[PDB]
């Protein structure tokens, strides 16, 4: 599923993401925007290390979900990577929360550093009623 901007904002808000571990909803929106373009079906295989990024947040198989084909990988979210490809983003959100409970927080995703950090991210939630 390809979410529309405000649709996703409210969906994320309902799932308890607004300010989760100090991360504003606009930051989450900026992350999803740059990671998948708000696409829950998005996948990116990393030929370099044999891992794959899954879903709207492009969560990596090396540490967060199990796809059974990533060398010495682990499953921190305790989910099949398949769960990160659902139209319903509840599992992906639970996993995204798990990622940020680690020291780096939102900085875990390099794309967030490149495209969202120290940026005016207000435009992501404007007019969405969140």
CATH number of the domain bearing residue 75: 1.10.530.10
Listed resolution, Å:
1.8
**Structural domain span for residue 4:** 1-130
Q: Quick check: 59 and 92 in contact, CB under 8 A?
A: yes
CB proximity list for 7: less than 8 A, separation 6 or greater: none
The encoded tokens of residue 24 equal 């504003």
Active-site hit among 35, 49, 87, 120:
35
**DSSP-based three-state secondary structure for 88:** coil
Cα dihedral 38, 41, 45, 46 in deg (nearest 10)? 30
CA dist., res. 124 & res. 47, Å (int):
32
Q: Quick check: 81 and 67 in contact, CB under 8 A?
A: yes
Give me the phi and psi of 87, to 5 degrees please. -70, -35
Expt. technique = X-ray
CA dist., res. 72 & res. 3, Å (int):
33
Active-site hit among 49, 53, 102, 120:
53
* Cα-based distances in Å from 98 to 74, 85, 127: 14, 17, 29
**DSSP-based three-state secondary structure for 35:** helix
- Any catalytic annotation for residue 53? yes
Domain count, the chain: 1
Give me the phi and psi of 114, to 5 degrees please. -70, -40
CA dist., res. 37 & res. 76, Å (int):
24
């Amino acid at each position: 599923k390809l979410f529309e901007r405000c649709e996703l904002a409210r969906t994320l808000k309902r799932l308890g993401m607004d300010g989760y571990r100090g991360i504003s909803l606009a930051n989450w929106m900026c992350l999803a925007k740059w990671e998948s373009g708000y696409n829950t079906r998005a996948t990116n295989y990393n030929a370099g290390d044999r891992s794959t990024d899954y879903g709207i947040f492009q969560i990596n198989s090396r540490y967060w979900c199990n796809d059974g084909k990533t060398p010495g990988a682990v499953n921190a979210c305790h989910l099949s990577c398949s769960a990160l490809l659902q139209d319903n983003i509840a599992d992906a959100v639970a996993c995204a929360k798990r990622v940020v409970r680690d020291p780096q927080g939102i900085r875990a995703w390099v794309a967030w550093r490149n495209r969202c950090q120290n940026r005016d991210v207000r435009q992501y939630v404007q007019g969405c009623g969140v």
